[PDB]
Amino acid sequence: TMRGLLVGRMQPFHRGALQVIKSILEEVDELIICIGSAQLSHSIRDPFTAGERVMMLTKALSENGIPASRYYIIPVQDIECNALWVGHIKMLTPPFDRVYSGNPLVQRLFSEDGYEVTAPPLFYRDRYSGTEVRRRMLDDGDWRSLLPESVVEVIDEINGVERIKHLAK
Amino acid sequence: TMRGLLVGRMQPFHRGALQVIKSILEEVDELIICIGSAQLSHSIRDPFTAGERVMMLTKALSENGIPASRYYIIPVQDIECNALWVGHIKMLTPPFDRVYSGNPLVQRLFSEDGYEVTAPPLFYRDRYSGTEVRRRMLDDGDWRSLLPESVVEVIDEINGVERIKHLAK
Amino acid sequence: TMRGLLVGRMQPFHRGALQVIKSILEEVDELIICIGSAQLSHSIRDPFTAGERVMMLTKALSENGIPASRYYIIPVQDIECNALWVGHIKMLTPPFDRVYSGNPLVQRLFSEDGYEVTAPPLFYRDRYSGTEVRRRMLDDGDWRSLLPESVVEVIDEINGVERIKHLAK
Amino acid sequence: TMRGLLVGRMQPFHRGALQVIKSILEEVDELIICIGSAQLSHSIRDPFTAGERVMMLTKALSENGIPASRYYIIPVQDIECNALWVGHIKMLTPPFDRVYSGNPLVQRLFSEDGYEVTAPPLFYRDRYSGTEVRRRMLDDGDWRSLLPESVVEVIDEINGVERIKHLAK
Amino acid sequence: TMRGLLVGRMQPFHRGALQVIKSILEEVDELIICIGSAQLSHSIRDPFTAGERVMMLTKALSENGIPASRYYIIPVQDIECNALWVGHIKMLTPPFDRVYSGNPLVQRLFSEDGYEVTAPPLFYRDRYSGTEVRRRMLDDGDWRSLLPESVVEVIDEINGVERIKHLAK
Amino acid sequence: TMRGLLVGRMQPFHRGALQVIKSILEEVDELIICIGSAQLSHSIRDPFTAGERVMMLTKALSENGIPASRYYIIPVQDIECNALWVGHIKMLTPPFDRVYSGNPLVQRLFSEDGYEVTAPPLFYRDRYSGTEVRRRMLDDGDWRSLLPESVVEVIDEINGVERIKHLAK
Ligand SMILES: NC(=O)c1ccc[n+]([C@@H]2O[C@H](COP(=O)([O-])OP(=O)(O)OC[C@H]3O[C@@H](n4cnc5c(N)ncnc54)[C@H](O)[C@@H]3O)[C@@H](O)[C@H]2O)c1
Ligand SMILES: NC(=O)c1ccc[n+]([C@@H]2O[C@H](COP(=O)([O-])OP(=O)(O)OC[C@H]3O[C@@H](n4cnc5c(N)ncnc54)[C@H](O)[C@@H]3O)[C@@H](O)[C@H]2O)c1
Ligand SMILES: NC(=O)c1ccc[n+]([C@@H]2O[C@H](COP(=O)([O-])OP(=O)(O)OC[C@H]3O[C@@H](n4cnc5c(N)ncnc54)[C@H](O)[C@@H]3O)[C@@H](O)[C@H]2O)c1
Ligand SMILES: NC(=O)c1ccc[n+]([C@@H]2O[C@H](COP(=O)([O-])OP(=O)(O)OC[C@H]3O[C@@H](n4cnc5c(N)ncnc54)[C@H](O)[C@@H]3O)[C@@H](O)[C@H]2O)c1
Ligand SMILES: NC(=O)c1ccc[n+]([C@@H]2O[C@H](COP(=O)([O-])OP(=O)(O)OC[C@H]3O[C@@H](n4cnc5c(N)ncnc54)[C@H](O)[C@@H]3O)[C@@H](O)[C@H]2O)c1
Ligand SMILES: NC(=O)c1ccc[n+]([C@@H]2O[C@H](COP(=O)([O-])OP(=O)(O)OC[C@H]3O[C@@H](n4cnc5c(N)ncnc54)[C@H](O)[C@@H]3O)[C@@H](O)[C@H]2O)c1
């Protein structure tokens, strides 16, 4: 049984990311989705806490009919040592075989540790990235389109827009 | 929409705990299951890492037909300050309303923070607790009975018995 | 009893800060004065150690005759979790009713935690900010004027000018 | 100026400690009073947070007629490296000259750094220990008589008894 | 090149430890000597600081003529995550091939990480353990005998006996 | 015995630093060499782990004919409190007397603690900075000539070039 690993900040979790996740789910049996930088919250760049993000990511995946048996959602706070980050991820995740990531460091860190590393099967355009979303949330610009309905609801509940706006004064 | 919170070490996740979880699931809409002491591993008292435990707890819940939309599985490392632990749980979980727990500290900490706290609707006997399980794993005594099949499989994969035994020399 | 809270780096404690403290003291019974970033020291931006600033405040608030029963001085180091910061502050301070701040992040954080948040009743021009005081110590300007005597005295003892000047080299 | 240092858990602050403090003032211009183990709270041995203790101290010292210029109250959280604790204490406090401690480690550590060290002037009788005080709160005893009224009023506000008692269950 | 690894508290470095180190040096090209619990100091159990023990080893290994090209001395503080410990050790040490330990936990940890694990080639009676050395310094026994001269010399400089004796009071 | 201290990132160790080290030995009985920022690795500015650096140092010092009794190599991880760094350094090293540093903060901090401080004897030309060395590895330049062979052999073993280059993508 083959398990893959993915790591992203998910600020917030958007359709782009989701399309990538479904993509990987066609190559592996189970995917371990790691919410990176779980310590950052309340900032224009990282406005949501690990909690809210686990929530968005949980409701969005069970909303798209993706069987809980196919994935794991784990928060991962950043640590001072790059040389200890993989060991850090490993202690928080189930045993995995392939690491999906197009980031040089993440690739190199896992690569150096013996894992098989590849780039995600899909690449979404910046127009769909969180920066657009957050940018729209502030500039009142239909950020919802870029997000899964369940995620909009999470954002609605936690007053995501109100927050990111005040933090922007 | 009502959400409850539960916190346990889950070393390992056993049928007792599971029966309690299904119990709470009849009173609340969603349950946030917190794997406490996520930093302890490789010891007779706490032999499994946060990772393996998220895994057991994930496979056992999707094995009993419990809809992913009804729960959240979050690791929670212990912190030096009891006075900051609830804020610690809150930052890692989705917004919750009721805290289930029969432990004086956990009750008092959440109670003091404004949350509604009650005792779990069900109480399993020690013969079913992790101490029995671990005790059996060492003493070769049919620990499997006490655990959900999916959990046995996790334990099998990570060589749980081999580990806890060596740690016991 | 009305307890308010204020939080700033006080690097160093200058007259404006005291003008504001005196004014907040007109609408609240007691004022909790939290020394932010208590862990930063020996830098052009943050030259004094938490210890020294706790000395500056205590000495200035006395020099200006202010019943010690009306204020508290508590150092507070920064934590990597903004979502944990308020609970952190709370754990180190007497129970308070209102928070005084102009910073959006401090404002939002304390607000999301359910506290009454408000702006200081007085805003002081940069001309009298810590930057101006620090820049003078460096360029041999008139820094003593921008500060309470007891503060000038503390700075002389610890050799603040000497230190800040060396670090500038 | 001759500043002396004093360190203790103060769980909670009792008349005994107070007289000791007055005694020390009789031989030191100023008394830097460090509240140890600031990170512990909500346990039988350490019921109060630090902020709570900072309140008791600040209140008792202002109600027993003691110049706010003659003392400092600094919460100090314990740290793993004993060989780095005195430095820690220093960093969080004003400059001192003599350490008043009855504890061997506290003595050996401060002296090792070169500080003048000497035992506490008085040695308040028993019936004046946090233990007896905490015990009475548990067993409905007369703890109030062992604490300065100013402190008793604090314990009432934070419902200490109710806490220590629930925690005790 | 065959690099082995050893790890112990060395509180203090005694003859037996050296007898074992010399023997491990007969089957490996270089030996990585990790000073465990580098954060503990000033206690009856762990009296010396990482600094001092790094001095003891370096001085003893030289006194006994051992090419410096054959060994490394690296302090290692303990971390709360056993599952992270090996990666921690690795980050601080040259690449190694085999680990020498009698402790089950160190054995299991390094083993689960894929390293060759083996017992020291020599076991020394308690009579010559750190406990015996420490107990003599306290009871005025013959501690110098149980240790290499360079070690006795280091202990004299830092006043190890004085310290250990005071902490005993 | 007159021990002097030296601190640097050594990313990586080059001939320049080495000559500086020999120079210092010409005026100090022993040289405590602290490798700073031990917690950084796998970045362009800090490619090597600490264990890697400890290897380069240990190797270069044993191959350039220098008595293992005349030096110590101690990895030092940076810490948040500048006012607690020299104490930190102390705790991890043998007792020293003089600090050789060209850095203003390092100077101001050590001197503030009372240590004799003086600049590095030599001032090795440019073309001998980690920057140039790291640059050459990136641009297939001749970095080897800037490092002692002993170090070059280390970089080859940990495939530094391959790393810094991938990281660079
Ligand atoms: N030492 C440490 O603590 C350490 C070391 C490495 C990484 N991390 C963490 O790992 C997490 C992952 O970081 P990362 O480098 O992937 O950055 P990231 O998760 O922040 O994403 C980087 C960029 O990649 C884009 N992206 C991601 N997947 C994409 C895809 N399939 N198609 C198109 N664009 C895509 C994102 O929109 C974003 O702008 C972070 O939270 C980081 O902090 C921590
Ligand atoms: N400051 C802090 O870091 C802090 C403060 C409080 C709690 N915690 C953490 O919270 C977690 C929860 O601790 P806890 O007090 O519940 O202890 P626990 O999870 O270890 O469980 C305590 C005992 O309760 C039993 N139990 C649990 N639910 C039961 C039920 N329904 N019926 C019968 N028996 C049951 C378990 O088998 C166990 O023996 C721990 O991991 C603890 O470390 C951390
Ligand atoms: N997670 C965390 O650790 C966390 C989260 C938030 C804030 N903090 C800390 O809170 C502390 C307070 O930060 P802050 O945002 O107030 O910044 P600050 O204290 O550094 O002050 C910000 C600026 O506002 C000016 N200012 C303050 N009060 C003023 C007034 N009444 N009139 C005019 N100018 C005024 C100051 O002179 C300064 O230039 C900091 O130490 C910060 O690090 C920590
Ligand atoms: N590395 C570290 O984090 C580190 C190292 C050393 C000490 N500390 C801290 O230092 C603090 C001080 O501890 P401590 O040993 O003084 O304990 P303490 O003062 O909190 O209590 C020790 C006992 O001394 C008694 N006592 C004190 N003065 C007395 C007097 N004059 N007459 C009679 N009885 C008296 C108290 O009633 C109490 O029972 C602790 O909070 C400890 O955590 C921390
Ligand atoms: N997570 C973590 O931080 C973590 C996990 C595991 C181990 N460690 C550390 O690893 C270090 C090593 O621990 P350890 O288990 O070896 O304990 P230890 O170094 O304290 O030694 C254990 C006992 O074994 C004895 N001993 C050692 N070698 C011997 C030999 N060849 N013959 C006879 N007796 C011998 C010692 O004298 C001692 O009484 C410790 O500092 C420990 O804290 C840390
Ligand atoms: N609180 C803390 O954690 C804290 C406080 C202070 C310093 N530090 C650490 O101290 C370490 C030392 O830093 P640093 O400032 O010495 O930097 P460094 O030595 O790592 O580099 C500074 C520059 O000095 C150059 N240099 C040094 N000696 C020279 C000489 N004789 N001739 C020519 N050029 C020379 C180096 O080539 C380099 O470019 C750092 O790793 C830093 O992180 C940490």
Q: Are C59 and C153 in contact (CB under 8 A)?
A: yes
How many other C-beta atoms lie within 10 A of the C-beta of residue E60? 26
Q: How far apart are CA B21 and CA B100, in angstroms?
A: 10
Exposed / middle / buried, residue B104 (Cβ in 10 Å: 0-12, 13-18, 19+): middle
Asked if residue D103 has its Cβ within 6 Å of ligand 4, the reply is yes
**What token pair was written down for B72?**
């959240």
Q: Enumerate the H helices of F12-148 as residue ranges.
A: 15-25, 51-63, 85-91, 104-112, 130-138
H, E, C per residue of chain C:
CCEEEEEECCCCCCHHHHHHHHHHCCCCCEEEEEECCCCCCCCCCCCCCHHHHHHHHHHHHHHCCCCHHHEEEEECCCCCCHHHHHHHHHHCCCCCCEEECCCHHHHHHHHHCCCEEECCCCCCCHHHCHHHHHHHHHHCCCCHHHCCHHHHHHHHHCCHHHHHHHHHC
* CA pseudo-torsion sign B65, B67, B68, B72: negative
* CA pseudo-torsion sign A59, A63, A64, A70: positive
Break-preceding residues in chain D (C–N over 2.5 Å): none
How far is CA F113 from each of CA A72, F36, F86, rounded to the nearest angstrom?
A: 51, 19, 8
How far is CA B26 from each of CA B4, B70, B96, B148, C97, rounded to the nearest angstrom?
A: 11, 11, 16, 20, 38
H, E, C per residue of A73-135:
EEEECCCCCHHHHHHHHHHHCCCCCEEECCCHHHHHHHHCCCCEEECCCCCCCHHHCHHHHHH
CB of E168 within 8 Å of a chain D CB? The answer is yes
Q: Is E37 left (phi over 0), alpha (psi -120 to 50) or beta?
A: left
Q: How far apart are CA F88 and CA F90, in angstroms?
A: 5
Question: Closest to F51 (Cβ–Cβ): which among E41, E58, E94?
Answer: E94
Q: Which residues of C touch B87 (CB under 8 A)?
A: 83-84, 86-88
Rg of chain F over all Cα atoms, to the nearest angstrom: 16
Q: How far apart are CA D132 and CA D129, in angstroms?
A: 5
- The partner residues of F100 in beta bridges, in order of sequence, read F6, F118
**In terms of Cα–Cα distance, which of F126, F15, F85, F24 is closest to F6?**
F24
CB of D94 within 8 Å of a chain C CB? The answer is yes
Break-preceding residues in chain C (C–N over 2.5 Å): none
Strands D116-118, D98-100: parallel, antiparallel or unpaired by DSSP? Answer: parallel
**What token pair was written down for E80?**
């709360």
Exposed / middle / buried, residue C69 (Cβ in 10 Å: 0-12, 13-18, 19+): middle
How far is CA A143 from each of CA A14, A45, D164, E146, F112, rounded to the nearest angstrom?
A: 10, 15, 49, 73, 54
Q: How far apart are CA E79 and CA B39, in angstroms?
A: 10
Count Cβ neighbours within 10 Å for each residue of C73-82 and write b for 16 or more, e otherwise. Answer: bbbbbeeebb
**Those residues with Cβ within 8 angstroms of residue C104's Cβ, 6 or more apart along the chain or in another chain:** A166, A167, A168, A169
How many other C-beta atoms lie within 10 A of the C-beta of residue F126? 8
Q: What angle do CA C15, C16, C21 make, to 5 degrees?
A: 95
Q: Are B63 and B38 in contact (CB under 8 A)?
A: no
Q: Are C34 and C89 in contact (CB under 8 A)?
A: yes
Q: How far is E17 from chain B (nearest CA, A)?
A: 22
Mutate to test the pocket of ligand 2, among B113, B129, B131 (most ligand atoms within 8 A of CB): B129
Question: Closest to D82 (Cβ–Cβ): which among E41, E51, E168?
Answer: E41
Q: How far apart are CA D49 and CA C91, in angstroms?
A: 6
Q: Enumerate the H helices of D26-139 as residue ranges.
A: 51-63, 85-91, 104-112, 130-138
Q: What angle do CA D146, D152, D157 make, to 5 degrees?
A: 155
Q: How far is A103 from chain F (nearest CA, A)?
A: 9
**How many A from CA of F18 to the centre of ligand 6?**
15
The bound ligand whose nearest atom lies closest to the alpha carbon of C15 is 3
**Those residues with Cβ within 8 angstroms of residue F56's Cβ, 6 or more apart along the chain or in another chain:** F10, F12, F13, F48, F147, F150, F151, F154, F155
Exposed / middle / buried, residue C125 (Cβ in 10 Å: 0-12, 13-18, 19+): exposed
Q: Do chains D and F touch (3 or more CB pairs under 8 A)?
A: yes
How far is CA D147 from each of CA B153, D7, D9, D70, D142, rounded to the nearest angstrom?
A: 58, 18, 15, 22, 10
Q: How far is E98 from chain F (nearest CA, A)?
A: 16
Q: Are A54 and B74 in contact (CB under 8 A)?
A: yes
Query: For ligand 3, atom 21, which residue shows the shortest CA distance?
Result: C8
H, E, C per residue of E16-71:
HHHHHHHHHCCCCCEEEEEECCCCCCCCCCCCCCHHHHHHHHHHHHHHCCCCHHHE
**What token pair was written down for D6?**
């004093």
**In terms of Cα–Cα distance, which of B82, B136, B75, B145 is closest to B109?**
B82
Count Cβ neighbours within 10 Å for each residue of A32-46 and write b for 16 or more, e otherwise. Answer: bbbbbbbbbbbeeeb
- Report the Cα–Cα distance between both ends of chain C, in Å, rounded: 49
**In terms of Cα–Cα distance, which of B92, B90, B96, B89 is closest to B1?**
B96
Peptide bond just before D12 cis, omega within 30 deg: yes
Using CA atoms in the order D136, D139, D142, D148, what is the torsion angle rounded to 10 degrees? 40
- The partner residues of B33 in beta bridges, in order of sequence, read B6, B73
**What token pair was written down for C82?**
């903004």
Q: Give me the phi and psi of C29, to 5 degrees please.
A: -75, -45
Determine the residue type at B117: V
Give the SS3 label for residue D23: helix
Question: Closest to A92 (Cβ–Cβ): which among B50, B90, B157?
Answer: B50
Q: Give me the phi and psi of A10, to 5 degrees please.
A: 55, 55
**What token pair was written down for F133?**
């060395």
**In terms of Cα–Cα distance, which of A71, A66, A68 is closest to A96?**
A71
Query: For ligand 5, atom 21, which residue shows the shortest CA distance?
Result: E8
Q: Are D138 and D14 in contact (CB under 8 A)?
A: no
* The total number of residues written for chain D in this structure: 169
Exposed / middle / buried, residue D2 (Cβ in 10 Å: 0-12, 13-18, 19+): exposed
**In terms of Cα–Cα distance, which of D50, D59, D120, D57 is closest to D78?**
D50
Determine the residue type at D84: L
Only one residue has tokens 């928060």, namely A75
* CA pseudo-torsion sign B120, B121, B124, B125: positive
Q: Do chains A and D touch (3 or more CB pairs under 8 A)?
A: no
Q: How far apart are CA E82 and CA E24, in angstroms?
A: 25
Asked if residue A77 has its Cβ within 6 Å of ligand 1, the reply is no
Q: Which residues of C touch F107 (CB under 8 A)?
A: 166
Q: Give me the phi and psi of B9, to 5 degrees please.
A: -75, -30
Peptide bond just before A12 cis, omega within 30 deg: yes
Query: For ligand 2, atom 25, which residue shows the shortest CA distance?
Result: B129
Give all domains of chain A, ordered by start, each with its CATH number.
1-169 (3.40.50.620)
Query: Is F168 close to A112, i.e. CB distance below 8 A?
Result: no
- The partner residues of F23 in beta bridges, in order of sequence, read none
Counting as contact any 3 or more CB pairs under 8 A, the partners of E are A, B, D, F
Question: Closest to E166 (Cβ–Cβ): which among D80, D83, D108?
Answer: D108
Q: Which residues of A touch F169 (CB under 8 A)?
A: 104
Q: Are D50 and D26 in contact (CB under 8 A)?
A: no
Q: Which residues of A touch B74 (CB under 8 A)?
A: 51, 54, 75
CA atoms within 13 A on the CB side of A70: 15
Q: Are C23 and F64 in contact (CB under 8 A)?
A: no
**Those residues with Cβ within 8 angstroms of residue C14's Cβ, 6 or more apart along the chain or in another chain:** C128, C129, C130, C133, C146, C147, C148, C151
